[PDB]
Structures are given as C-alpha cells and as structure tokens.
Amino acid sequence: VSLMEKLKWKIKCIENKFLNYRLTTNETVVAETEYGKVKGVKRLTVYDDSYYSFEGIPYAQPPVGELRFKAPQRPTPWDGVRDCCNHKDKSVQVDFITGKVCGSEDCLYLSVYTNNLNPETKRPVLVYIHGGGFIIGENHRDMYGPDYFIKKDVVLINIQYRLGALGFLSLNSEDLNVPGNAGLKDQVMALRWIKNNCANFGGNPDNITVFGESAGAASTHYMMLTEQTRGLFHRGILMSGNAICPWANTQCQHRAFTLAKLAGYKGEDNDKDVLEFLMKAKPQDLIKLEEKVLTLEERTNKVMFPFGPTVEPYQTADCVLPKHPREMVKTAWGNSIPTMMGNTSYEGLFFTSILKQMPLLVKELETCVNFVPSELADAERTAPETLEMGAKIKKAHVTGETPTADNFMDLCSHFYFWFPMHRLLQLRFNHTSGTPVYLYRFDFDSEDLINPYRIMRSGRGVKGVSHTDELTYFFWNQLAKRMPKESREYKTIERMTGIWTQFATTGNPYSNEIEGMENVSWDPIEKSDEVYKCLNISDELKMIDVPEMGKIKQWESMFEKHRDLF
C-alpha cells in the first residue's frame, strides 16, 4: 500500500483516537458475567445517539506459551470488577496499510453494545464475526463501530478469534494435539459465552443471530454446520460467503514444515520437531512469513491462503470440522434455522488491485483451466476434460475475442462467491426440515461514504459495488462521517440495519416499517425453483430474478458427467 495512504491512515488513526476520547462519557456501569463483574462505559455517536460499551471481555484463556496452536480453554474468573472501558489488541496479523506486523497473541476477547442496559423486554442478540480471509481483521471500533446498529433496540456483539498460522496450524500426528481449526474453536467458545451471558446485558438468550462477511460468512456457516454449537443460536446471515467456497478450507498439514523452514528451522520433517520449533518462534516472525508459504503450484491452482479451516486429521474433545464441509451440510443442525444469504452486484471488482500487479492473470481466461473447480481439474490442468470444463467457464465470461480485466473480475465473482452459494443451496435442499432461506443482492453504489477495505482493493474512484462495499452501511469506521439524514447513503444505513434487525427478531426480513419496502414481496427460495429470486438493494428495493443465474447454470454444467461431486 502506498506511502500516501500510509501517512493518510496515520492521521485518521490519530483523529479516531481524539474523536474516541471525545465521544467517551463518565457514565461507567457494571454488569454480571458468569466469570465475574465487568465495567463498561457509555459512548456517543456522530448522530447524537449513545450506547453502553463493554470491550475486552475475555471469553477464553490467553492462548500463549503452551496453549499456542491449541484449542482454547475457559478463562480464569476473578473477584472484583474487571475494567472493560478499553479495547484489547487484535490477533497477530499483517497490517494491510503499512505491511508491518501488529497485534498480539492475547487476542481472545469480545465486545458488547446496547442503547439500554435495562430494557423492559429481552432484546434480539446479534453476533458479528469479522472477515479477513482468516488472516486479518479485528473487533476494534475504528473498523466495526456499533453506531448504526444501536439506533435499533438490539444487543450487538463483535468477537475476535485467532488468525493465520496461530489460528489454523494443523499437524497429522495425533500425539501433539494440534488437529487444526483453533481459530474456529475460539468462535465456538465465544458463542457459548454469549449464550450464557447475554441476558445480563438485556439480551434474549433464546433469540440470537450470528452473521459475518467473507471469511466471517464462512465462519458463521461453520458455526451452523458443527455439532459443537447445536442450538446455540437461532438465525444466520451469510454475507458474501460460506464454507464450501474454494477459499474457505484447505488441507495445510504439510505446510507447517514449510513455515518452520522459512523461519529458520533446522532438522527433519516430522511433526514433533516441527511443532517444537514453531512453539518457541516469535509470533510476529511466523505471521510475516505466511505470505511465502504457498508454492507456485498452489497459487496456480487458486489456493488463496496457506493456513485456514481444515478437515481435522483425528477427532478430539473440541473437534469442529471432522469431515469436508460438503459432507457436514448433510446433517448440519443449522440447516433448520432461518437463514439469509447474499452477495454484492460486482463481487470480483475487489481484485482490481491484484490485476494491477499481475496483468498476466488476465491471460488465464484464454482457456480458463485454472478456474475449474479443483476437485474436477487435473494436477497440471492439461487433460482434455479440463480444457473442456475451462471452455464452459470461458463461454460464461469472455465477451470478446480476447479476455479483459472486466471478464476476469466477473469470473471471480462466480468462482469465489456465486457458484459456491448455488452449490450450497442445492445441497442444503436435499437435507433440510424446510426452514426458509432468503436471498438479497447488494447493489447500492456510493463513493460519498467508504470503508478501509477500499484502500486495500485500490477501489478509490472505481464504479461498481465490490466485495465489502456493504460493510460501510452496517458499521461506523474511522473513514466515516455524519451523513445528512435525507441522503441516499443515510437511507441505506437505515434500510440495511432495519432488515438485519427485523430478520434477527423474527426470522423474516420483510418489514413495511422499512422505507422502500412497501411493494416488496420477499419470498424464500424453494427446492423447486429453477430461478432464484432476491431482494435487490439499490436506490430502490426491488424483488428480481438473480441476474447471475445463467452464468451459475453454466458453471453447474461442468458437473454434467460428475453429478456426485456437485
């Protein structure tokens, strides 16, 4: 990221800190938790609303020393009052703005927010799991400010979880107790905490909604798939992602050795000796080198991250993913709760930045063999069958004689997002009680209000609604400003938070008290639907057939001769 966005962000970081001190009040309050008392503080928003803020609540033991790479354990309770008027640090990670490593291993906390600690009725609880490809992200309010949501009468909770190799290291040997998915196990334990403690903050423990975007959507989906969380919550929202996305799981059992070797390890490839080295390495050395772990073959086969959620090699006490996600959908308790899913109108637009550095990537669309689902494609991507599948993909997105950057970004939309959603809906249909799933499409474009992901994707002055463009209308961030209440952006905040809270409350997203929704008939998707219908969200709200549907069926026809793998 540029020297200009570095000094620019540095200034906004200094501004957000002064604004945060300014928007703080003297009204501290104390709440009960099952681990002891916590002290929160009341804060202000730029729209002159206020909320109670409990930050840095530990939901697990700090996963340092001998707990590194290990499943999390419950934290130690305290007497007295724990100070929660400040944020703790984020997980160790590479800062996308600077490129420096930041964060700390002591990262397992959650934050709780609400406009009223003593509501006269129990409120719907909303749990946000942040995205960031399982390698970046945080629950700090400079990125995920509760300001928009606390205009509503909900309890909003933002969690953190271990990222990167520290969150997702996986070793085959059953004796060392590092099956993988530690970061997901973090999320489970936070869900358990939220279930037993939200009532102390005015939350209804029988009405909990979990949601997230990108990796957060995949996380949300995993929390719906695993037996570990059965009955913990009651609604789910998958925003631009789920667990059968190609980027949302990887078999990384061999990559530990590689990481150890990048970090200066001397010796052989057995897990024990590898683990011993990694266990004493500086956290920020491991994270800084994760970028270098993937082979050129792996990057070629579109493996996006070295460490991430994985099928665990053996089962233990806190096992989360004992089988491939497609298999888990077949018994998943979460299939039987109300679900909403969606995508933006131009997801792949996110990859503008990557294309700018590698224009050679556009030539991949000459045969498109690299984008054929990996379970179908051959190693070298040279078999005639693979060239055949690649051709069907090519027909879907190459509009001219030569592929363009726009063709490319349009393909990514489907490869990374629309096609996986399709596969999930059809799999779920064969294995469900018949609880509704609702679809939306986020199509509202604006440059007048943005979020920090736009700095990373180099989305400055770029038309179209990219992946993460919607976050701006759910959460306050240090690049936000107060918007006139009649502006299109303000109306979209209102609509977006209105629908999400309406869904959270009732398991049904429709409300006539939401402006623009008076002609809306939002029906869920049925197994017998050849065509998906979705609430299209732009300047107006309108029910439509998903525009991406023809290209989706094109991708599905790759599985004409392998219908078992669909």
Side-chain angles (χ1 to χ4, degrees), residues 272-290:
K272 178 178 178 170
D273 299 336
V274 161
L275 178 62
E276 258 157 78
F277 180 80
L278 292 182
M279 287 279 288
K280 73 188 64 181
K282 297 179 185 56
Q284 62 268 22
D285 285 339
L286 298 187
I287 297 291
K288 177 218 285 268
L289 299 161
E290 274 188 46

Side-chain angles (χ1 to χ4, degrees), residues 331-369:
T331 47
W333 72 267
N335 287 350
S336 301
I337 65 181
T339 311
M340 182 159 66
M341 309 178 196
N343 287 296
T344 72
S345 62
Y346 203 169
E347 295 277 2
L349 198 59
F350 186 88
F351 299 90
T352 270
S353 170
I354 301 87
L355 278 189
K356 235 129 208 176
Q357 220 61 17
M358 308 195 52
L360 276 188
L361 280 172
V362 178
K363 296 290 290 299
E364 288 185 341
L365 269 66
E366 246 146 17
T367 55
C368 290
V369 294

Side-chain angles (χ1 to χ4, degrees), residues 409-428:
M409 303 188 296
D410 184 44
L411 196 154
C412 292
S413 296
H414 288 82
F415 182 72
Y416 294 116
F417 299 108
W418 287 103
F419 188 52
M421 176 191 72
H422 177 49
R423 303 178 68 173
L424 176 63
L425 290 167
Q426 296 302 319
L427 192 59
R428 187 185 170 266

Side-chain angles (χ1 to χ4, degrees), residues 285-403:
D285 285 339
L286 298 187
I287 297 291
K288 177 218 285 268
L289 299 161
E290 274 188 46
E291 327 176 350
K292 289 182 182 269
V293 173
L294 288 175
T295 65
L296 192 40
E297 288 86 353
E298 280 163 333
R299 297 165 196 271
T300 290
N301 284 251
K302 305 302 182 181
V303 179
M304 177 171 288
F305 310 112
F307 301 93
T310 199
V311 179
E312 289 168 64
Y314 52 86
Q315 270 173 304
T316 49
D318 306 271
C319 180
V320 172
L321 314 186
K323 303 189 70 62
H324 280 97
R326 280 181 74 266
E327 297 296 310
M328 301 186 71
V329 175
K330 299 163 187 189
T331 47
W333 72 267
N335 287 350
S336 301
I337 65 181
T339 311
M340 182 159 66
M341 309 178 196
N343 287 296
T344 72
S345 62
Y346 203 169
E347 295 277 2
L349 198 59
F350 186 88
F351 299 90
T352 270
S353 170
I354 301 87
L355 278 189
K356 235 129 208 176
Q357 220 61 17
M358 308 195 52
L360 276 188
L361 280 172
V362 178
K363 296 290 290 299
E364 288 185 341
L365 269 66
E366 246 146 17
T367 55
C368 290
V369 294
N370 283 351
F371 289 104
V372 166
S374 66
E375 61 266 27
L376 296 186
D378 56 319
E380 282 193 332
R381 314 252 170 175
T382 53
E385 187 164 25
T386 302
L387 183 67
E388 281 175 30
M389 288 153 166
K392 301 183 168 173
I393 290 181
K394 184 169 182 205
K395 290 173 165 86
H397 309 282
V398 179
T399 54
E401 174 184 333
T402 297

Side-chain angles (χ1 to χ4, degrees), residues 148-195:
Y148 302 157
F149 267 114
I150 59 83
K151 292 186 167 297
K152 304 296 198 179
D153 291 341
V154 297
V155 179
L156 174 60
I157 294 160
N158 290 78
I159 75 182
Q160 276 182 172
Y161 56 92
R162 267 168 296 173
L163 298 176
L166 293 172
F168 296 90
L169 199 77
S170 177
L171 302 171
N172 281 327
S173 162
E174 193 168 339
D175 306 26
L176 309 157
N177 193 62
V178 182
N181 301 325
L184 289 177
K185 295 169 187 184
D186 292 339
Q187 299 175 6
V188 170
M189 185 157 298
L191 284 190
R192 282 169 187 155
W193 187 97
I194 292 171
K195 176 59 126 159

Side-chain angles (χ1 to χ4, degrees), residues 228-275:
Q228 297 287 12
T229 55
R230 198 173 261 257
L232 248 28
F233 50 100
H234 314 90
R235 294 95 164 73
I237 309 175
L238 277 33
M239 316 173 53
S240 301
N242 65 82
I244 72 176
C245 287
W247 48 267
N249 61 277
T250 197
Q251 300 306 100
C252 50
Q253 282 74 33
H254 186 4
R255 299 182 185 133
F257 170 76
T258 298
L259 176 66
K261 297 298 289 195
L262 283 158
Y265 167 67
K266 268 84 173 314
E268 305 299 316
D269 177 20
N270 59 83
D271 294 346
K272 178 178 178 170
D273 299 336
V274 161
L275 178 62

